[PDB]
Amino acid sequence: HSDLTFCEIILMEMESHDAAWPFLEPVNPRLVSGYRRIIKNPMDFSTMRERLLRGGYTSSEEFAADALLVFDNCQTFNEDDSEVGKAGHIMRRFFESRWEEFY
Ligand SMILES: Cn1cc(C(=O)NCCN)ccc1=O
Known part of the structure; x- marks a missing residue:
């Protein structure tokens, strides 16, 4: 239980x-050119x-795999100095930090 809470x-x-604004909702491939082709999952x-x-x-591990996929996809599709990319790095570092001061 304490895992999932x-x-x-x-x-x-x-x-x-x-910095969560790029990841609140699924990317709309109609609006983001090339996303369907580049991002598989x-x-x-x-x-x-x-x-x-x-x-x-x-388990908590399946949850973490989905979180890391958000930021892997972000780094795959977006330049590190793009607005989405810059926001993804803040979110990825925030997640890894808070995930570690638990496990
Ligand atoms: C995760 N991600 C978000 C966007 C975006 O523009 N999000 C705001 C929605 N209006 C574009 C590419 C991408 O990989």
Whole structure:
């Protein structure tokens, strides 16, 4: 239980973070040119939110794999100095930090 409750703590904190604006909702491929082709397995916070509430996570590790996928996808598609990229690095460092001062 305590595994999944901190996933709630960290997802909530990521949802309300200042730099979370690029990851709240799935990327719209109609609007983002080339995203469908480049990103095979998209992931975002709302999709993680949906899965967590239905309890579709077996361990904290499956949750972390989805979080890392958000930021891997971000670094794959966006330049490190882009606005989305700059925001992804803040979010990735925030996640790794808060994930470690638990485990
Ligand atoms: C994660 N990600 C977000 C965007 C974006 O523009 N998000 C704000 C929505 N209006 C573009 C490329 C990308 O990889």
